[PDB]
């Protein structure tokens, strides 16, 4: 019928993509942690901090085929596209029967006594069979497990101190019937079955807090193009818009800006420290003005 | 202003920004987080229109 009708909306599409990361050439020490000649016990788990490096995770696939690679807050495939605040590698040797227990929210002896992941957990739990390195006929001295813990552990708590657990109703000083001895180190023989066999587990703890720091994957940057509708990735911040020179007076401290409604409206360029405003690309509704089909097929 | 402010809410999702959900997660997980956001935004629009 004759009239004006609203149908589709219009948007101006981007013409190119801008990828900007700080010019960091140092590679992250993932092989030193995974390929170490000696690893800490599950009780005394080794927390290695990875920072100021390129988080190229292809090296883990080069290291070994894996029995487990369970990412909880991220997809394994996309780790190379992200930036992280403070990657932590928790490295230890555990019994195979407890490997499936290293997960957020689990209950059991290992979760409660040596190593706990927070219920709200972003990261990856990587595990593989390690019999080829640490299995000995005489038995190694690397295993060290808490037999019984006085109280449950909090996430990422490591109770290094060793104390006698009181099993009886009175204080006990080394007397068998009342003292429970708090450690269960054991040497391992190559002949034990899979549930007993050691697995080497590395937990990568990630905090994706809008990349205040770097630890970014192996992405190649491009040139910075202004005054055009473009897609962009600024140190992990992904979006679409028009980048312009900013007149905002940022303190050396602030890195990103937001509007009164908390949307992003400015970024700091990771390589030049230039402040850029983000203007959304043109969009609006489209109306069609029709004289009516039985009059004319011309429209505006 | 209220209708715009509702976009920053998570509604139980890991993030209020769809680009971050799609950037970090595989489709089978992203669909769950996205559906949580769709429900929240759709309820916000129905409240606004009413």
């Amino acid at each position: 019928e004759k009239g004006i009708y609203q149908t589709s909306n219009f948007r101006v599409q981007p013409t190119e993509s801008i990828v900007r990361f700080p010019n960091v050439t140092n590679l992250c020490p993932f092989h030193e942690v995974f390929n170490a000649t000696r690893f800490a016990s599950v009780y005394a788990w080794n927390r290695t901090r990875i920072s100021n490096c390129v988080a190229d995770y292809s090296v883990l696939y080069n290291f070994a085929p894996f029995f487990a690679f369970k990412c909880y807050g991220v997809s394994p495939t996309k780790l190379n596209d992200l930036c992280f605040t403070n990657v932590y590698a928790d490295s230890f040797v555990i019994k195979g029967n407890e490997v499936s227990q290293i997960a957020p929210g689990q209950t059991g002896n290992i979760a409660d006594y040596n190593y706990k992941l927070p219920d709200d957990f972003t990261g990856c739990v990587i595990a593989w069979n390690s019999n080829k390195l640490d299995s000995k006929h005489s038995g190694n001295y690397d295993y060290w497990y808490r037999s019984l813990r006085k109280s449950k552990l909090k996430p990422f708590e490591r109770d290094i101190s060793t104390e006698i657990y009181q099993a009886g109703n009175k204080p006990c000083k080394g007397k068998g019937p009342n003292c429970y001895f708090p450690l269960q180190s054991y040497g391992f023989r190559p002949t034990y079955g899979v549930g007993h066999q050691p697995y080497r587990v590395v937990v990568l703890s990630f905090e994706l807090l809008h990349a205040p720091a770097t630890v970014c994957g192996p992405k190649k940057s491009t040139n910075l193009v202004k005054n055009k509708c473009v897609n962009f990735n600024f140190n992990g911040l992904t979006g679409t818009g028009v980048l312009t020179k900013s007149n905002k007076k940022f303190l050396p401290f602030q890195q990103f800006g937001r509007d009164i409604v908390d949307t992003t409206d400015a970024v700091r360029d990771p390589q030049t420290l230039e402040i850029l405003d983000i203007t959304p690309c043109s969009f609006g509704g489209v109306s069609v003005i029709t004289p009516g089909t039985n009059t004319s097929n011309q429209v505006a | 202003n209220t209708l715009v402010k509702q976009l920053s809410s998570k509604f139980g999702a890991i993030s209020s920004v769809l680009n971050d959900i799609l950037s970090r997660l595989d489709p089978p997980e992203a669909e769950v987080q996205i559906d949580r956001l769709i429900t929240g935004r759709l309820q916000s629009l129905q409240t606004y229109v009413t």
């Binding site: 409604v261 949307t263 959304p280 969009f283 609006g284 509704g285 | 202003n1 209708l3 715009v4 976009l7």
Partner: peptide, 29 residues
């Protein structure tokens, strides 16, 4: 003598109460 050709009272009424989507660019126009 004034643009918009409003009366003195209308001009006062328009000055007392306070096209491009610079704000709220989230599909709201």
């Amino acid at each position: 003598s004034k643009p918009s050709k409003r009366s003195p009272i209308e001009d006062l009424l328009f000055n007392k109460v306070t096209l491009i989507c610079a704000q709220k660019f989230n599909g709201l126009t």
